[PDB]
Write a protein that binds this DNA or RNA. Sequence first.
DNA 1: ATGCATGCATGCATGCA
DNA 2: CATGCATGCATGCATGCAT
Lengths: 611, 606, 97
Amino acid sequence: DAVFGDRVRRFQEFLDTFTSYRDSVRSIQVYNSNNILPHRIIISLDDLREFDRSFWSGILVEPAYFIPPAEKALTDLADSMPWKLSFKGSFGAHALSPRTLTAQHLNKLVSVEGIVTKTSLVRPKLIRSVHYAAKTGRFHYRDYTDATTTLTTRIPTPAIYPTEDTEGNKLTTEYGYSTFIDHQRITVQEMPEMAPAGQLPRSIDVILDDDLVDKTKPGDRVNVVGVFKSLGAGGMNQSNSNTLIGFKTLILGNTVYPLHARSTGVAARQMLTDFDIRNINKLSKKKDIFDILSQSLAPSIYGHDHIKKAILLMLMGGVEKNLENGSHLRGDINILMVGDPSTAKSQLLRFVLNTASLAIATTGRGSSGVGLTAAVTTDRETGERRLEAGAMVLADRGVVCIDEFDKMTDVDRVAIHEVMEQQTVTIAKAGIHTTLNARCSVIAAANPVFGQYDVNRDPHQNIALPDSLLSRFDLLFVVTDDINEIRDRSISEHVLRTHRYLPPGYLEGEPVRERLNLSLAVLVTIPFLRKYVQYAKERVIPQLTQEAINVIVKNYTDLRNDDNTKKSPITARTLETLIRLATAHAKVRLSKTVNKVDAKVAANLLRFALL
Amino acid sequence: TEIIKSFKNFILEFRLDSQFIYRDQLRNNILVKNYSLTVNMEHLIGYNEDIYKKLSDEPSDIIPLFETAITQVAKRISILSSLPTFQLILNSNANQIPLRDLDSEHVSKIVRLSGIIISTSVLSSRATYLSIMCRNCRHTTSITITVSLPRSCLSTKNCGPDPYIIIHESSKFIDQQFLKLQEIPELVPVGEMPRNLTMTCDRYLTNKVIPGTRVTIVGIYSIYNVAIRTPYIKILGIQSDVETSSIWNSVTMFTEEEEEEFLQLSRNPKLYEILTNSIAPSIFGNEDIKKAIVCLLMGGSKKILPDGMRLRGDINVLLLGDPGTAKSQLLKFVEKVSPIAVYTSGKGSSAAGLTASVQRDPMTREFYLEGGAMVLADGGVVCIDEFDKMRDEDRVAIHEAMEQQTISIAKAGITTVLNSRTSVLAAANPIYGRYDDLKSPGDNIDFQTTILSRFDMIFIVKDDHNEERDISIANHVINIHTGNANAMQNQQEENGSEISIEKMKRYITYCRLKCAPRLSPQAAEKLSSNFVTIRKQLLINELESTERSSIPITIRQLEAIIRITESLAKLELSPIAQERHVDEAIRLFQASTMDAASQDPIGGLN
Amino acid sequence: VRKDPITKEWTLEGGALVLADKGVCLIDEFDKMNDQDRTSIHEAMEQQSISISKAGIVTTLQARCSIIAAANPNGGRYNSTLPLAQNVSLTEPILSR
DNA sequence: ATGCATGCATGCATGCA
DNA sequence: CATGCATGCATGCATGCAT
Ligand SMILES: Nc1ncnc2c1ncn2[C@@H]1O[C@H](COP(=O)(O)OP(=O)(O)O)[C@@H](O)[C@H]1O
Ligand SMILES: Nc1ncnc2c1ncn2[C@@H]1O[C@H](COP(=O)(O)OP(=O)(O)O)[C@@H](O)[C@H]1O
Ligand SMILES: [Mg+2]
Ligand SMILES: [Mg+2]
Ligand SMILES: [Zn+2]
């Protein structure tokens, strides 16, 4: 009875010392004085460790006797100037996974990372029930509670819905004046990247409510911070129930974070500071910007300067349109490479898979054409025939990297025609008729039909793809391994230079260590490239101008009536391609007008790709 | 009472092997936070037989006494040098009883069984200290551990029946697990379904075996519920008999004596020859194949660049040749002398795949890796026999696994990039039954010649018919059967001229774990000058002729040699690779690949 | 890895090659097998062992048994004009053991 | 004229209620 | 666990083109 108040005081003086969280109280409060933000604050456990070790160890080891006091202190501060708490920072040995969670950790605050495997349907929960009595003309109210509402244990109460007033007057429900709170239950499993091969994985349930009720979707990588609890009685109460059962366990979540990985739905994100923005703006002034940002892509590969420029343009992307009637004009860029063996194709696909904010990788004969377009007519537990998302659906607003693209059969290639140009997946099969969004872009690699590019034969004899498919690819590049003497000396020296490199903080001969990269979502280094791309894509939308209009219309007309031979046919789509590329370049310069240089660069790039 | 006294005396003073072992074992365990003690039951046929016969009979009543005795002696150990009850693991090496002979005479007695595990459930929570409260008057109390909660209020104003509630915030629990044992599926009856058994373990004996392990159990044959009950086994100890290696159970701890032994071996001025002579000494010749199989087991040196690109550090080897040249026996040997290794064929193994498979869980209906040879062997070696016959999806997957060291899965619902860092040793046979001299090497295979550029070294072993080497081989194979070439002729050679299979297996693990060589500036020049030379003599002969060479020379072979050279320095624990190693790298590369292009009409011109 | 008809229990059951260890396997109609049977027999006759990776069970089993097989030639009549390797469907890797 | 490759049509495996 | 319908994957056969 007295420890509670002492703990309340100790958290009040903890808030008093560190004034950051005080600031973040006026913040979600002055703004609710005209989306109401939710009253949840986040505290760093490192600060709480450096302030008071005993209180820190209590939260980590004995949450049920330390958290409610902190919540009461926080509510008191807010009212003086309820509010709930979330925790971030180091967790020591408490940071576990579904495989390593044992009975030793029950009734402790833990953080668990894994893959979200099964979500539920959000439902409301009754928390206060109001009633009206017309005979007396008065309002009454009842309250309810359950085990999973508070951390401490409270004697069960006899939940009963009132129907008659003490005087006998009949009551009627006032559904609009009652209180309801949302509730979801999810399942977390051990990630495939960490689970041992050939062994069945382990799972754990998590319960979320209120403002944490819908923040992740199945198949995502998640990190949940909450209390590991026990409920019920494993036959103990019963005189004779069984001797082979135990108590039921679950996690009362209070924080959920989505983690970004490779070939996963969640998209990476960084927090941009004033320093980052200033540096980006300063860097964008230099005239060689398109070359600085372009030679820094895969700097361990020699040459391919134009494929690298195309990669950067695809990363930046153009601007799409939506007319009033309801028309849609594509705004993405797609790339195809056809090449000889050992021309650094799969090593550029993997670079894109590793540097793009969201990308999914797929091979050729590997994934069928229903696994890409989401034809997952399946059934759920409720019984509703549902479509399960696919590679191109999950990659909405992302990229798809296709390796061995020539091995994909026609029955599988024809499913991608709609996605590459209409940017939708309309599935109509027994009992189901729906349309999903697939606004993705594609980068694909392939090799000739003869093993190597035969220069004597016509391009159609080598590439061997339909013109329908070839039109949808914006840029098609041909790469050849021609044996030289001057070039071989340079490419050997470069390769041998790469193979002699020591990471900082290592001793020559010491093996290097590898780790998995699970970041927390929300020449120049790679991080700066990501920051630059994010800023440019999120805060720039250029507009066409007459000069670009003239350059594009001249180039298109000249290309259509030509006596040359092209690796791909020329249609109306090419015009749009010229408009896209131009816009992308204007996006790289952080300009709001597609100037003439943009159009000229687009023309040069397309002409190199074709001729 | 006397039981607890005798047990305490036993633990405190046994002194077998002129040393007290349980005392020091407790001293170590109480520090490493392992509240348990392991004791052999035959030791108790010594010090006192009365307690041994009192334990083997009516064990359910005696075990608790021993455990509390251990707790009270650990008290003394801690004080002289709050914790929970100490668990007793009970190993044994006595006669076993077949799983099919358990009957009434064995009920409630300690028994020894042997079998194979086939399933292991998830862990369960059992209570060891309950805190309870009366819902009417708020009387609080506790329980210590079938026990049940007080039927009536103990405060003695009528609280009623079952007035207590469990206060979980202050209670204590422990783990539990279930296991299924099945009789070895090789002495079953001749067409009757095999028997099986259930078993329950707790506390410190959970998460110690995985399905498919052959094991021995010591436990209690107990019974649980017209007058028919269900038998089962209460585990007291488990001992693994047959297991399988993998990445997760690998041992990274080296004893000081082992370190000194390996450091002494590293300085042998003839190590590179002893290692070669230890590779399959029962086959005749094939010196260069063995020298390559040695560089294969060490690997190169993987690098990571500040741009996120990953450089490979493994060797892939291909063997083409006629039937009966002992190229299948070599793969079987490579399988036995590597820490992690899988041996398979092109079309997979019986009821086991070749690459990653993603099937749904038997119970949960969720996605899980079933298991594939290219992911089971991560960090090891995969030996693929009959490389020429296999499915197309397998080809496309192995191509990625062989350079990017990973397999990517994009199925409905699940998308993941796995890890497959292995080395491929492949054996194939030419079409038509013999390797024709008139036809180019590319026309003697049954798959795209674009695949031959993947491997780092290709050997073409041909069986030439000669009346001398025939008698030589006949005498050699007669000797191994006669027994004079058995373990009489290779034991003489272990005296500094040969290594054993387990010594060398550990010497490979130590080298992989400790050393990662790096070329020197002189070796870079000597490697960059040979490459610009091998590729002029291919352009010349291709320009002269009309067709292209079946065996191509690509940038993947410059790195293949940088890997052969970095691998020849890693067996000596050397931190820098010198031109002395580049010379041997070039020599090995000329005997395998350029000797394969030497037989092509176009590439082998001049 | 199948289910027991009566006990509702999983059972790891090796084929006739793992059940015939230290014995003999008598195979009839040896020329009319599917892919699975050919792969299993190939592994047994090569390494005298059988691997398995199914439903959480990753193990190997001994198959040290001799094999006696019966078959019929292509087309139902032996053609003495051709080598034996062309009168039977079995490939060379299995016919060399 | 023969052989190989590609596309199509027939079969099976799954999944279901 | 048998019956019968709809999806999706795999295989074998036929036809056309090239050498
Ligand atoms: N231009 C290049 N610069 C540097 N390394 C290269 C270059 N071209 C090829 N390589 C190397 O050769 C190897 C070829 O592998 P990969 O990229 O898969 O070939 P492919 O072009 O068939 O995809 C890579 O490991 C890469 O490091
Ligand atoms: N060079 C050799 N030295 C010793 N024994 C050999 C040699 N070549 C073949 N043998 C014998 O032949 C068998 C190997 O045949 P196998 O490897 O199955 O043929 P293949 O290599 O065509 O698959 C072994 O039993 C081995 O004793
Ligand atoms: Mg490739
Ligand atoms: Mg063989
Ligand atoms: Zn009471």
